[PDB]
Amino acid sequence: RRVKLRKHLVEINADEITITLSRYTSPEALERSITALAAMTGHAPSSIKEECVELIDKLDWLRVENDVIQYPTLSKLLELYNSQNHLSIEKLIAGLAVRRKVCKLVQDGHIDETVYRALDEMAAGA
Amino acid sequence: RRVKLRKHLVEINADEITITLSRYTSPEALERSITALAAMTGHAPSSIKEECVELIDKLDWLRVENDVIQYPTLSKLLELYNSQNEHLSIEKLIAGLAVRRKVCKLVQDGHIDETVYRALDEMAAG
């Protein structure tokens, strides 16, 4: 009920808070997310870890075919865009999951007008 | 880190977390929200508390006919709807009523009729 499952992202809703996890979430960022949910819910950190771990295990990486797009690719692009403007990793993940031609261009290192236009589109939406 | 101010709601974005606060957030829910932001950011709770308090101070109540719509009105309506469509969050009912003067008046007068139920269906689909 508190959980919305997508292919690349999972969102966990607990009153005032929303936590969004992916396959790109680091173990440290996951420890903090688990403590942030435990302060809202009063649930044991052990039980929330187990659940969070099952949910990310059902998520997939971004892919140009079966070739996985890696975190430095995603972060170096986010830095490039934001030092010129805001775009969150959650919206870049969700935006690239529906833009095949853009995932290939990004994977090959061709950050052109087509890519810049996709990022403007992502930032202008939810 | 990133803050989105609206007339009745504020959203605070810190990596994996988004916290949404209003003038209707209780002291206890505001306590949990501050501790959840401190676990993400590593900032001092007393310092996060001052920031949230500054932002909640910039937000306004829902209003109709020279009056303020109070929390028991909003919560008793949320219970009424959700014990039937079992979902609408306080954040979406706030955002929905902020643009619906006739519905704010109907709710304030205790006339929860088809017009109200239709507005709530719209917010929950939305």
Q: Closest to A86 (Cβ–Cβ): which among B2, B35, B87?
A: B2
Contact between B33 and A40 using a beta-carbon 8 Å cutoff: yes
Q: Which two tokens stand for residue B109?
A: 């007068």
Residue B66 placed within a domain = no
| In a shared domain, residues A43 and A72 | no
| In a shared domain, residues A45 and A91 | no
| In a shared domain, residues A99 and A52 | no
| In a shared domain, residues B76 and B118 | yes
Contact A23, A56 (CB under 8 A): yes
* A1-16 residues labelled b (16+ CB within 10 A) or e (exposed): eeeeeeebbbbbbbbb
A48 exposure class (CB count in 10 Å sphere: 0-12, 13-18, 19+): buried
Give, in degrees to the nearest 5, the angle at Cα B61 between A38 and A3: 30
Residue B28 placed within a domain = yes
| In a shared domain, residues B46 and B79 | no
Chain A residue numbers with beta carbons less than 8 Å from the beta carbon of B33 are 16-17, 40
Which positions 44-83 of A are in contact with B (Cβ < 8 Å)? none
> At what angle are helices A100-107 and A89-96 packed, to 10 degrees?
110
CA-based nearest residue to B63, from B24, B30, B121: B24
Specify the residue for token string 């059902």. A58
Q: Closest to B20 (Cβ–Cβ): which among A16, A29, A86?
A: A16
- Separation between Cα atoms, residue A114 and residue A99, nearest integer Å: 11
Beta bridge partners of B68: B63
Q: What single string gives the DSSP state of each residue in chain B?
A: -EEEE-SS-EEEEETTEEEEE-TT--HHHHHHHHHHHHHHH---HHHHHHHHHHHHTT----B-SSSB--HHHHHHHHHHHHTT-----HHHHHHHHTT-HHHHHHHHTT---HHHHHHHHHHHH-
- Separation between Cα atoms, residue B122 and residue B97, nearest integer Å: 11
| In a shared domain, residues A51 and A90 | no
| In a shared domain, residues A69 and A116 | yes
Q: Which two tokens stand for residue B26?
A: 């209780």
Contact between B16 and A29 using a beta-carbon 8 Å cutoff: yes
Element (H, E) at A37: helix A27-41
| In a shared domain, residues A77 and A46 | no
Structure determination technique employed:
X-ray
Element (H, E) at A63: strand A63-64
Residue B37 placed within a domain = yes
Resolution in A: 2.3
- Separation between Cα atoms, residue A100 and residue A14, nearest integer Å: 33
Quick check: A33 contacting B, CB < 8 Å? yes
Domain carrying residue A48: 3-56
Quick check: A22 contacting B, CB < 8 Å? no
- Separation between Cα atoms, residue A91 and residue A30, nearest integer Å: 19
Residues 6+ apart with CB under 8 A from B77: B93, B107, B112, B116, B120
Neighbours of A94 (CB within 10 A): 20
Contact A41, A51 (CB under 8 A): no
Contact A40, A19 (CB under 8 A): no
Residue B65 placed within a domain = no
| In a shared domain, residues B15 and B49 | yes
**Residue at which a domain ends, from A15, A35, A56:** A56
- Estimate to the nearest angstrom the gap between the alpha carbon of B78 and the chain centroid: 11
A125 exposure class (CB count in 10 Å sphere: 0-12, 13-18, 19+): exposed
Quick check: A32 contacting B, CB < 8 Å? yes
Tell me the C-alpha to C-alpha distance, in Å, between residue A121 and each of A38, A91, A104, A114, A124: 35, 10, 18, 11, 5
| In a shared domain, residues B78 and B110 | yes
| In a shared domain, residues A48 and A77 | no
Q: A123 in helix, strand or coil?
A: helix
| In a shared domain, residues A73 and A93 | yes
Contact between A36 and B33 using a beta-carbon 8 Å cutoff: no
Tally of domains in chain B: 2
Q: Which two tokens stand for residue A51?
A: 């659940």
**Residue at which a domain ends, from B56, B83, B102:** B56
Contact A20, A9 (CB under 8 A): yes
